[PDB]
């Protein structure tokens, strides 16, 4: 999805992925707690 939208519109890509992960943590840590699996699910649902 990410590469398809770059074509249709490497440290920078790592920066945007890590910023998305930190935004997910900062938005939903009170919801998930310290559950790695719940945050993995939320990352997988909200990334595309």
């Amino acid at each position: 999805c990410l590469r398809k939208r770059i074509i249709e519109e490497d440290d920078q890509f790592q920066n945007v992925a890590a910023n998305f992960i930190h935004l997910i943590v900062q938005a939903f840590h009170s919801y998930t707690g310290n559950d790695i699996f719940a945050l993995n699910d939320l990352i997988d649902f909200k990334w595309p």
Partner: protein, 434 residues
């Protein structure tokens, strides 16, 4: 440093007790019991006298260790004089112990020079024909957890075993091992009559000098298999003789709380093994900072440590549920009342923080149930045996057919304990008082 590797290996196998038999370590407070067990097993194996004796002591109190030491002692000098049958009360049932005795009898008699073939009736009457009925071979029975076979219904195996002790031509030694102090009251009257009433209570640690002497026995290398042996023995004697050393303080703490040398050994072993050189080991045994780190790790998943991993929404929901449970008279609550208390607390905080909806508080509630903060009301939990667990699995409980917001729960931690170790500077600390 291969010498440090040799010294580390020697210290590690002294701590695991896996030395050769002639180098085995008997503590001074265990010596009288060891001599009494040695006299009984020598009168059985050497002198062909039949014996019956139950060893009574707590778990990890060297009942198996002393028996194994005595059997390996008599193994090297009288090997063809005896065979050993081992039964364990957890592994063996009343029917299965007959098959276990028969299969151990054939594989032990093939080791010196069928009995185990057929149905249970045939196998049991063949065992009786062998035992109930140059020198005679002694049969030594080691019966661990013998309290499980002294039940209230019927004690058939103990009856026939003690009958073999008291009324047979093959000499037999039967050692029972249990943790139950009142083991003689467990026995049926005819079983008790056939029993010899010989009960050996294992010695306890009576004073701190017994623990210090046992630690000295465990950590002193009495053989010159490393060049570092003399310096290690000198430093260990310096730390043990000093009353204000850290190792003496840890021994004193164990004496006051656990009073268990296996407990201390479980901490000493990774202190020895995680050292990488001789001076690092000397610093580790002089400071015992690893013992503090180990003690911190042993408590990290307790109720105190599980609370310190909670998030702010998790802590708020838990505080609200503890408030509702304190106000209730049965100590019971559900998701709806806890959410009402939570929304009331958030409103009175923001009137003086995001309020989450019930849909999202459902997940935090499930995590709190999962981490054993809440439990279901009057739930039995884990059953004692497989029969009762099997009965419980075929029953549909009323707390699993109603919706989750009406299930009754009770707290594993009360609001006063919540107030005690939540910090005073926390956001929701003021609502721990009611």
């Amino acid at each position: 440093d291969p010498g440090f590797g040799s010294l580390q290996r020697r210290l590690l196998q002294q701590l695991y007790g896996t030395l050769p038999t002639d180098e085995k370590i008997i503590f001074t407070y265990l010596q009288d019991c060891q001599q009494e067990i040695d006299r009984i097993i020598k009168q059985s194996i050497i002198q062909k006298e039949s014996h019956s004796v139950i060893l009574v002591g707590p778990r990890q109190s060297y009942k198996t260790y002393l028996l194994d030491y005595e059997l390996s002692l008599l193994q090297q000098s009288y090997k063809e004089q005896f065979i050993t049958i081992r039964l364990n009360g957890f592994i063996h049932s009343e029917q299965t112990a007959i098959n276990g005795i028969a299969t151990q009898l054939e594989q032990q008699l093939q080791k010196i020079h069928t009995i185990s073939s057929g149905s249970l009736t045939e196998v049991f009457e063949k065992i009786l024909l062998l035992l109930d009925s140059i020198t005679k071979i002694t049969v030594v029975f080691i019966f661990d957890e013998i309290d499980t076979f002294a039940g209230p219904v019927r004690q058939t195996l103990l009856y026939n075993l003690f009958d073999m002790v008291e009324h047979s031509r093959v000499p037999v030694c039967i050692f029972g091992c249990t943790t139950k102090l009142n083991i003689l009251e467990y026995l049926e009257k005819r079983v008790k009559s056939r029993f010899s009433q010989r009960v050996i209570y294992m010695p306890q640690i009576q004073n701190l000098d017994d623990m210090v002497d046992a630690v000295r026995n465990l950590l002193t290398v009495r053989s010159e298999i490393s060049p570092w042996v003399s310096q290690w023995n000198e430093t260990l004697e310096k730390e043990l003789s000093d009353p204000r050393s850290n190792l003496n303080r840890h021994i004193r703490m164990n004496f006051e709380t656990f009073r268990s040398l296996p407990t201390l050994k479980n901490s000493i072993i990774p202190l020895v093994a995680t050292s990488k050189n001789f001076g690092s080991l000397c610093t580790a045994i002089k400071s015992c900072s690893f013992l503090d780190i180990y003690n911190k790790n042993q408590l990290s998943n307790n109720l105190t440590g599980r609370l310190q991993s909670l998030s702010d929404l998790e802590l708020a929901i838990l505080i609200s549920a503890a408030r509702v449970a304190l106000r209730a008279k049965d100590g019971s609550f559900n998701f709806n009342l806890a959410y009402a208390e939570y929304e009331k607390m958030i409103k009175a905080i923001n009137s003086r923080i995001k309020l989450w909806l019930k849909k999202d508080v459902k997940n935090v509630w499930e995590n709190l149930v999962q981490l054993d903060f809440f439990t279901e009301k009057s739930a039995v939990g884990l059953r004692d045996n497989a029969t009762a667990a099997f009965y419980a699995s075929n029953y549909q409980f009323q707390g699993t057919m109603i919706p989750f917001d009406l299930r009754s729960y009770q707290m594993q931690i009360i609001l006063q304990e919540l107030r005690r170790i939540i910090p005073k500077s926390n956001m929701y600390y003021s609502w721990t008082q009611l």
